[PDB]
């Protein structure tokens, strides 16, 4: 179990602090090649005549698009989400306004979510933006998703061993470790931190001395919180295929300013963004999904940092189609 040099290294810190990335070229290149499959933008069409709000029968989101654009969007969508399945993955073969199949109405919500991210989570996704491809990677079910309990393999395009199967209790500690970069942290960062906004990530105190009245007995947060926060940060690390010094000077994890990189503020936004998507878009979809889709507690599959990033500090190495398909936002 080893990885032959050279190693690609960068600097994220004042010299002598040993801060920065540490990359094995073959892996980086293997990820580059995978992320290279991002289909190119379909050719630009000329906007002719009538907003499909007039033209078509059941168009709610993309209603201001002229036809030609609209069908370019529909082709792009098909190319990103359901390439194998073709247009009828979502449409009635003989009625295109029909909402008969759930992918139609899920897709409709996913056009709104996608446009939200690009319009409202600028502080994360900036001018790169996401498209459906970012998560779906050419399949209807996106490869990395999270249920309300750790599952395995992380790539759901792989087949579980018995142990891996969520039903096999003996496989729990492993299902959990493999989600926290192989640690034995007995916590699930996902349901603790990412599924919603219940829990506070910061544990470290901000005064030298213990403030009287939050520092004894049931006043105190339990050490277990610190474990959880370590668990979450191990997960973020593995999700972005990087290490703590991508964001922190370990001198003081808790301090900002010179003691943190730009990417930590971007990360701080991403946690918030993920909670929005989970609470307000993805988790509700259990209303609309086949039971075939749902976790053991009837939860829709939802998202974490892996769902977009898939092992890369910027998903798809920063590939963008934001300017190619503005239907998807930033929406004025």
């Amino acid at each position: 179990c080893f990885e032959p040099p050279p190693a690609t290294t960068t600097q994220t810190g004042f010299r002598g602090l040993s801060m920065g990335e540490v990359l094995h070229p073959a892996t980086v290149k293997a990820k580059k090649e995978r992320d290279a499959q991002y289909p190119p933008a379909l050719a630009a069409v000329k906007a002719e005549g009538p907003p499909v709000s007039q033209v078509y029968k059941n168009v709610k989101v993309l209603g201001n698009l002229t036809e030609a654009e609209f069908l370019r969007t529909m082709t792009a969508i098909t190319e990103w989400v359901s390439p194998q399945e073709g247009c009828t993955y979502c449409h009635d073969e003989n009625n295109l306004a029909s909402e008969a199949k759930y992918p139609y109405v899920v897709a409709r919500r996913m056009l709104e979510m996608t446009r939200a991210i690009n319009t409202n989570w600028t502080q994360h996704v900036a001018q790169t933006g996401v498209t459906c491809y970012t998560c779906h990677r050419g399949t209807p079910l996106p490869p990395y998703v999270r249920y309300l309990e750790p599952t395995l393999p992380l790539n759901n395009r792989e087949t579980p061993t018995h142990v891996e199967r969520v039903e096999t209790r003996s496989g729990y500690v492993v299902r959990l470790a493999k989600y926290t970069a192989y640690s034995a942290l007995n916590y699930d960062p996902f349901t603790m931190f990412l599924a919603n906004d219940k829990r506070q990530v910061r544990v470290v105190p901000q005064t030298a001395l213990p403030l009287v009245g939050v520092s004894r007995g049931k006043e105190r947060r339990p050490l277990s919180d610190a474990y959880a926060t370590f668990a979450l940060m191990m997960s973020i690390s593995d999700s972005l295929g990087t290490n703590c010094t991508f964001c922190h000077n370990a001198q003081t994890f808790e301090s900002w300013g010179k003691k943190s990189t730009p990417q930590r503020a971007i990360a701080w936004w991403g946690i918030r963004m993920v909670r929005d998507l989970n609470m307000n878009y993805l988790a509700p979809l259990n209303a609309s999904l086949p039971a075939s889709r749902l976790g053991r507690q009837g939860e829709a599959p939802q998202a974490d940092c892996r769902t977009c990033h898939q092992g890369v500090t910027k998903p798809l190495f920063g590939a963008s189609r934001l300017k190619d398909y503005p239907e998807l936002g930033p929406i004025k």
Partner: protein, 273 residues
């Protein structure tokens, strides 16, 4: 000036190099050629430290830091204030340490005793090289080395560790810590026991070699022996760094992921996956 018993030992000879020229003592210190190089370098190193530290802001001892260059200067010479000092101070350090070491050999020779202490001292010098020379060479920049500052060299250890997510699971480190901890226990055991025998308390008779053996046969079922417990400790201490050196070297040049994942080789045997 001289211990009660010293004079009979202060004879010429034993030099590695130089012979009679520096073969003499200043106070208690033997000089010899390497004592002279030692001093030359110490004075250099310490001078650069002060000249460099004066260019910096702080004079507070805990805060002063002389760091290496940016990774960009690679393995080349860096401007004085931006790593230049650090590269020079490192060279003085090695000069100092190795002179110290060779000097011990000459003292050993002159007293007709084995050279085991200068040998034992090679280990720390080695580990200093693994951290400051070998690993930076393998990774291709002096920038990866550690800064010369009482506290700052800790911030380096801290980050270096967390670059690999949890440095604790580093099998080299695990082995390294294990020797640090036994060695410490055994030094307590071996000292306590020698004192326990020579200092029985009240007015009891000093005890015997046969006692030493009995105590550990009684307590833990095995006594290693008087000569051997010194051969063990030299061994336990030495392997703190000799095994550790592997965990340090593997990190980057041979493993770029978190260290917990390395244990994948076990956890992921497909037989029990």
């Amino acid at each position: 000036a001289l211990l009660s018993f010293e004079r009979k030992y202060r004879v010429r000879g034993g030099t590695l190099i130089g012979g009679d020229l520096f073969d003499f003592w200043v106070g208690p210190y033997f000089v010899g050629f390497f004592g002279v190089s030692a001093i030359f370098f110490i004075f250099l190193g310490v001078s650069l430290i002060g000249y460099a530290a004066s260019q910096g802001p702080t004079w507070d001892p805990f805060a002063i830091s002389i760091n290496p260059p940016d990774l960009k200067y690679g393995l080349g010479a860096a401007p004085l204030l931006e790593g230049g000092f650090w590269q020079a101070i490192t060279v003085c350090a090695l000069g100092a340490f190795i002179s110290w070491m060779l000097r011990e050999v000459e003292i050993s020779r002159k007293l007709g005793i084995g050279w085991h202490v200068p040998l034992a001292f090679c280990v720390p010098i080695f580990m200093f090289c693994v951290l400051q020379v070998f690993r930076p060479l393998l990774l291709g920049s002096w920038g990866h080395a550690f800064p010369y500052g009482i506290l700052s060299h800790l911030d380096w250890v801290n980050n270096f560790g967390y670059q690999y997510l949890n440095w604790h699971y580093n099998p080299g480190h695990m082995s390294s810590v294990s020797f640090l901890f036994v060695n410490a226990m055994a030094l307590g055991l071996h000292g306590g026991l020698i004192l326990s025998v020579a200092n029985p308390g009240d007015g009891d008779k000093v005890k015997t070699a046969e006692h030493e053996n009995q105590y550990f046969r009684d307590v833990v079922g095995y006594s290693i022996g008087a000569l051997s417990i010194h051969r063990l400790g030299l061994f336990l201490a030495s392997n703190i760094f000799l095994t550790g050196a592997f965990g340090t070297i593997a990190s980057g040049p041979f493993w770029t992921r978190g260290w917990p994942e390395w244990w994948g080789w076990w956890l992921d045997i497909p037989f029990w996956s």
